[PDB]
Amino acid sequence: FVEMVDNLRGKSGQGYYVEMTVGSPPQTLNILVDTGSSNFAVGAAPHPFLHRYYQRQLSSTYRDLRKGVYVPYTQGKWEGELGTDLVSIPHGPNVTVRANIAAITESDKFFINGSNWEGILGLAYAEIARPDDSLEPFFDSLVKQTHVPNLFSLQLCGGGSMIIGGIDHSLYTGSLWYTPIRREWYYEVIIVRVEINGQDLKMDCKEYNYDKSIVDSGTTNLRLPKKVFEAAVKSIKAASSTEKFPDGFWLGEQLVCWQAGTTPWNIFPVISLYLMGEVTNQSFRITILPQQYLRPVEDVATSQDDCYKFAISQSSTGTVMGAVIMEGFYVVFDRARKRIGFAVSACHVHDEFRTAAVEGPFVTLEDCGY
Template structure:
């Protein structure tokens, strides 16, 4: 019995190594998103692109930059096709302009056929490429309405091209693991593309609906600081029986503009007032708890996301966990909670372990993984590390489960409330997608054309009448209209 168990355990460990050891296909440095290697053109050119659920377009640098001299050389690809049409894109940080082109694209770490896909070759950019970044563009995985734009141009995504090539819809899974150790700033992860008819696993029991198929918009109901696990369980129990305990005001503020899951963003971005509220609570808990890392060491500039905090040794944080409540896809009266440890939001910014070198000192620096975001809410990869996320694009939901790699996260729930969450949090405000917007614009143009034609006919009617109708002898009757009076004065 013991031998059998040990054999099974060894096999399980080997499988984990195969999947999460040598099987990593996502990499990134501190403060940068996760990137993947792709092949473009023939002969192939190997490039690295960010895996970005916050945009749609495959966009590649086509010129050498100060940040990096590697780029896609269009003249060296025999399969390159240039439409000549100008397109552009603007992000929360930076923008670019370029041209719409197409070429053969392949991702070697995925068991997928090569596809001819639309992409943008970036010819000019502003604050888009990060200094020292090891990537040359990004692979957008969101829906069509948030792609690059131009005059009379629709840029099809790589995912849409793949679906057309396979003749069936696909989904994808992101497993972001973070750094492998406290002394290493390089983070690792995995991207898998799944056939929704055969490969979607059944153990994804926590699902949240995609409210609008543009970005991956979800219902973020609240973000809380877990000061005491036992107390939080009691509060959650109360919430299941009393909907009035649910913080509707916070929920509405979080989703006022939009709440999205964005792997291309580093931090958890909150509306300004809520950012201040959460950070102030974190600071207060640190002061009251009197941990081994006193609050006077972590200066206010750190909490305001202005400066990094550094120590001579890597830190094992005993700070509070954060809880993120998400609307459940199972019921409009149900939600569940993602619980993330301080290792997620106390991000490693740099790690220099130079112990033993004469005249040098080790330094480990951290930055806060929370930031103010104006009016929008963004769950960046800080909120995703330690979870496996399954993006079912066609069915319109995102599944969550805890990961076998990365921070030790938790998922609790589901919790029930007595009133509609989408209604009380105002998550059902109509938002038009591109197809609806185009149709609405067409109808609006039609109505405007009809109105304009009616007005024109009305104005031209007297002239047409004069041309078609034989003039009658002038009457001696005096008209009471101002126009007639003027006419009579002139005569």
């Protein structure tokens, strides 16, 4: 799938986007690749953070659905009007589909300054689509209207690639390990074990999935439930005891800086998340390096140093395997087989001592879900 390789641009902090065309004549927009939502929602009115927007009046294929949509959430707000129009992905499948579009007229803390994207491609299931499950998501429309296989894959690089309808073997090394999609709403998965520098957190596996565990490209951080987060911070603090950082750094509210090229990657531990396998009590592990959980914050003002933000944060809505976890892994969203595949990416993170990995099988001779 050579033409789809390198079709994504961006970073973990501001999100990965794909170029898409909306309407007829086609209007070009950069769209956020989001596996944690289900609406194809685009800016359709001027905004201080929007460089361009969807102009419905200039589209002869636009159809108004005469239904408003108001989405109030924790991190922000957005409202608009529902409609349908012709949609295509220039560096994706060579197809044109009619898909639902949420025309964003008003928003609060939704769009990001200098993100370079004007909309969101909600790749999750209809159950979480707004205003309700009757609003068919883009991928469902794509699969229904074309002969594109019910599968997509993400290769997020610290740029990247979105392969629609298949797996590109040039984007990964070794074997692909599959975890079952527990329920088709968010991309829900099951964590069976968490290790910090090979040391088990020793918690009932349900704790890692309170109240759910999801794979989300639309979230930066690895988000963990309160109890899991505290024990993880304690284990990372103990492993990196040679240096003491402010409480603010551990809360994700302040930066940690070291002289350019002197980051002590070796003092920080590796994090292993054991995901539920396709067979009973069997599992595989994904290993995360500090290079993934210590997200660099690019700022010309602080450029004499390399400054980092701790990319592990507290969650009250379950575990979120964000962009920092997805980076350096080729993630296969096998919708047709209700499973998520993980393999070491060609753009994986590694130093001379350690490498990010996808390894198994592991046997644990209870149900880890909620």
